[PDB]
Design a protein around this ligand. Structure first.
Ligand SMILES: CCN(CC)c1ccc2c(c1)Oc1cc(N(CC)CC)ccc1C2c1ccccc1C(=O)OCCOCCOCCn1cc(CO[C@H]2O[C@H](CO)[C@@H](O)[C@H](O)[C@H]2O)nn1
Ligand SMILES: CCN(CC)c1ccc2c(c1)Oc1cc(N(CC)CC)ccc1C2c1ccccc1C(=O)OCCOCCOCCn1cc(CO[C@H]2O[C@H](CO)[C@@H](O)[C@H](O)[C@H]2O)nn1
Ligand SMILES: [Ca+2]
Ligand SMILES: [Ca+2]
Ligand SMILES: [Ca+2]
Ligand SMILES: [Mn+2]
Ligand SMILES: [Mn+2]
Lengths: 223, 220
């Protein structure tokens, strides 16, 4: 199986697999069952921003999600990436839908990593119809209104999964990275599902079979 | 396979499986490859003390090892016990030797856990038939607990593994705990002593002498 470190923006509580009873953001280390979560007052139809940061000095992964004019949701956790991830990885964005659904629209994505010094930076503020520096998996598509649609849209569809990975491998392991993305999750359902994640993976990571819904396109099961 | 959280006092560097290049203390969460380590200035033949603490407020596992009039060695790490361990556990001490060897002698051992429901035990002496301990492998009692095999002349043996678990199951989440032990390692020494928390049915995995400390079935 693939090795995954991720930050999830989990819009749909699946309390049967350990997710708190409310929308939450969490840090996922080799399992969909987050090591730590924070309540997320998710806003249907508004543009939100997510910011992820890591350094090898304190070796803590930290994330914050926000909308303009509202309090943000943060979470942080100890993790030594040398133990969890291979030395070279692939960075990406993942999303899914299940029974319930929502748009998983990405309007912008930036990433910076330094390994001290060698560095990689990319910034997307728009996405073209053939964005050759992204590897699109599953249902993900680019270029409709200049955005990245991680899951299928006609209006959002159910039982969809998709992801977009930066084309180049990244040398992940002082060592550090940051990622930022903007997203629009809209849904006609009064329950949106399921969510978006920023992830870091083995270079040859692919969508696990049966990873729609509560598995976010990241994991082959809920273990 | 068992589920293990442990504090290791690692006397022998196995750099081929990620242990730093010096004796160290480490926090192990479901792998012998420590999540975090600190350098440990181990003192051959001198009684040492280890203290381990955990609370569900900050959900951090901490540990300190020291000797009289020396600097201590300390390590801490975020651990959410609910998503690592089963709800009921046993607690114990484990040790091993390999191609290099040491005595792994425990002179006292205490433990406290609160959830209020509470459990506490304190051993400042061990008897020959210590009915509230489960002895696994080469471990023996009777006033000390000898985790690994010591011959009749008092010299340790290689290729040995042994554990002692408290007799009752322990309710570890539904939260805090503390453990202390004192030990005497005499010998290059190998391999170390751990305090661990396990599934209730845990037993020494086959082939877990040497670097695997009696805890883990492989070095994954
Ligand atoms: C009353 C509780 N709720 C409302 C939230 C509920 C909803 C749907 C079912 C529910 C229950 O129960 C079953 C049970 C089964 N069984 C087999 C005959 C008995 C277990 C078959 C299908 C469904 C279904 C079902 C019916 C029609 C079409 C599909 C299904 C269908 O998808 O159901 C999945 C199996 O649900 C079993 C019970 O799960 C707990 C309640 N529940 C169900 C769902 C819907 O989950 C699906 O969507 C989620 C959000 O997008 C994803 O996170 C998730 O990965 C995904 O499988 N959530 N909460
Ligand atoms: C730390 C220094 N290093 C790395 C360069 C090292 C490397 C090889 C040996 C080393 C030491 O020490 C011995 C000692 C012995 N003795 C006689 C039984 C004791 C003096 C025999 C073989 C070896 C060998 C040896 C030479 C050739 C072929 C095989 C081996 C040899 O050690 O074979 C056992 C399997 O080893 C594969 C190589 O492992 C990586 C390096 N390293 C360190 C050690 C000693 O390990 C053994 O003891 C440890 C301490 O109790 C245990 O933690 C551990 O589980 C255990 O396997 N092994 N290797
Ligand atoms: Ca969920
Ligand atoms: Ca090309
Ligand atoms: Ca070792
Ligand atoms: Mn979740
Ligand atoms: Mn070690």
């Amino acid at each position: 199986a693939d090795t995954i470190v991720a930050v999830e923006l989990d819009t749909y509580p699946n309390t049967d697999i350990g997710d708190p009873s409310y929308p939450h953001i969490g840090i996922d280390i080799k399992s969909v069952r987050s090591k730590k979560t924070a309540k997320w007052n998710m806003q249907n139809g508004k543009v939100g921003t997510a910011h992820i940061i890591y350094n090898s000095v304190d070796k803590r992964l930290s994330a914050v999600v926000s909308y303009p004019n509202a309090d943000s949701a943060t979470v942080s956790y100890d993790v030594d990436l040398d133990n969890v991830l291979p030395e070279w990885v692939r960075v990406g964005l993942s999303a899914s839908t299940g029974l319930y659904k929502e748009t998983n629209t990405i309007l912008s994505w930036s990433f910076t990593s330094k390994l001290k010094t060698n560095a990689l930076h990319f910034m997307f503020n728009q996405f073209s119809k053939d964005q050759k520096d992204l590897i699109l998996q599953g249902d993900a598509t680019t270029g409709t209104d200049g955005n990245l649609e991680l899951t299928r849209v006609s209006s959002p569809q159910g039982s969809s999964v998709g992801r977009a990975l930066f084309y180049a491998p990244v040398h992940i392991w002082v060592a550090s990275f940051e990622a930022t993305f903007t997203f629009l999750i809209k849904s006609p359902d009064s329950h949106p599902a399921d969510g978006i994640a920023f992830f870091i993976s083995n270079i040859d990571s692919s969508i696990p079979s049966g990873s729609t819904g509560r598995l976010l396109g990241l994991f082959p099961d809920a273990n």
